[PDB]
């Protein structure tokens, strides 16, 4: 239940970040609907494939939220990007948007399952623990792709406030105005710098190699364990 509560919260925290970037209830209500659709879907799958609601499956849902919201964000954001580049009605934009990212979405769902599925193949004791995540997460992101080209575009087509050419929202007064005016300006500096660092190549390869070094280091020094020893609120005393 304590994990459950965290899902509920993370969804609520997600919906807040969304409101920030997306600027409008109905827009940000889109990725908010997607996440529990998939999560609930996953509980269906688990039940079919014969699993149970356990600590690992639950965390699986939890971790799934990142993968889920990204499918949703990617779709909504794209449509919104289109509406500002090329000033288009909602239905039109999503219709050309989904054409433009549908491939990547199904492609990626595969590349990713390559990083989760192998987990389902550990052997003995260790195996079953890891298998739980593997099916859950893989299931959950299948539903996510499926949902992202069945429901997300429908929602994106209906519920999106039309955006005009160049209306990046720098113009509206109030805090959202600042954030948009800041983001726009911040964006430029981001490419102004990437424009710059690209000119060198060299200096950043070593920088990268440093990171690889450090990673290797921090990893080989960091200890290992299976599962933490939770305070169960009970314990034993033995007398000999």
């Amino acid at each position: 239940h304590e994990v459950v509560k965290t899902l509920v919260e993370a969804i609520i925290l997600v919906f807040l970040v969304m409101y920030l970037f997306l600027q409008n209830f109905r827009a940000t209500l889109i990725p908010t609907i997607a996440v529990p659709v998939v999560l609930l879907g996953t509980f269906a799958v688990l039940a079919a494939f014969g699993f149970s609601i356990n600590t690992l499956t639950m965390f699986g849902m939890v971790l799934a939220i990142g993968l889920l919201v990204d499918d949703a964000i990617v779709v909504v954001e794209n449509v919104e990007r289109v509406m500002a580049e090329e000033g288009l009605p909602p239905k039109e934009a999503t219709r050309k948007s989904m054409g433009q990212i549908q491939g990547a979405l199904v492609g990626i769902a595969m590349v990713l399952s390559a990083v989760f599925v192998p987990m389902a193949f550990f052997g003995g004791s260790t195996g079953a623990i890891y298998r739980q995540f593997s099916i859950t997460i893989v299931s959950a992101m299948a539903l996510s792709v499926l949902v992202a080209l069945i429901l997300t575009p429908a929602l994106c087509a209906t519920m999106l406030k039309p955006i005009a050419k160049g209306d990046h929202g720098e113009g509206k007064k109030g805090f959202f105005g600042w954030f948009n005016r800041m983001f726009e300006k911040s964006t430029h500096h981001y490419t102004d710098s990437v424009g710059g660092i690209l000119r060198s190549t060299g200096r950043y390869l070593v920088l990268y190699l440093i990171i690889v070094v450090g990673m290797a280091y921090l990893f080989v020094r960091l200890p290992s364990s299976f599962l933490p020893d939770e305070d169960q609120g009970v314990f034993m005393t033995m007398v000999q």
Binding site: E2, T6, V62, G66, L67, V111, T191, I197, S224
Partner: protein, 179 residues
């Protein structure tokens, strides 16, 4: 044991193989996957940075949330180069231009998913009480991994691409395509 332990190194090998293969098929290339595969360490560095900092172990919960970070990192990489590549094919733009134009298109959605997810798992790292140990492990790893993935990658992916394009160009580059 008993009866064989330590099987993961082998599975992450086929895993790192199948991942390249799929990406190879996705980009219709053997050379481009590298400008996605190279983002893997940009999130591990942060997952590690955190678990040590906070005094954690490499446990089942740390591992799984590491992948989740690897996945999202990879996805964002994938979409950036997908966007850059499709700007030198569908339109006819140069390497630097295709990269820049792609990477600004992809910046908003990435900050979007990062903040929402990091913030989203904050309840876990902050958590105390029942099941806390679990929640803290899962949450700390992902939190660190997601921070360093975001900040590192968005300045590293643009590089990976333009670097691997240049080590595997065939004299048809670079200036500007048409048509």
């Amino acid at each position: 044991e008993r009866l064989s332990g330590n099987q993961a190194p082998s599975l992450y090998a086929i895993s790192l193989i199948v991942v390249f293969l799929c990406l190879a098929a996705l980009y219709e290339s053997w050379s481009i996957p590298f400008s996605v595969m190279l983002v893997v360490p940009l999130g591990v560095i942060g997952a590690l940075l955190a678990a040590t900092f906070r005094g954690l172990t490499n446990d089942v919960y740390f591992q799984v949330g590491l992948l989740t970070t690897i996945g999202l990192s990879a996805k964002n990489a994938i979409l950036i180069v997908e966007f850059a590549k499709d700007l030198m094919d569908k339109e006819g733009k140069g390497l630097i231009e295709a990269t820049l134009d792609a990477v600004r298109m992809r910046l908003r959605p990435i900050l979007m998913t990062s903040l929402a997810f990091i913030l989203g798992v904050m309840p876990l790292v902050i958590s105390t009480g029942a099941g806390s140990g679990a929640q803290n492990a899962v949450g700390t790893g992902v939190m660190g991994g997601m921070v360093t993935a975001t900040v590192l990658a968005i300045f590293f992916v643009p590089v990976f691409f333009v670097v691997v394009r240049r080590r595997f160009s065939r004299k048809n580059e670079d200036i500007e395509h048409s048509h």
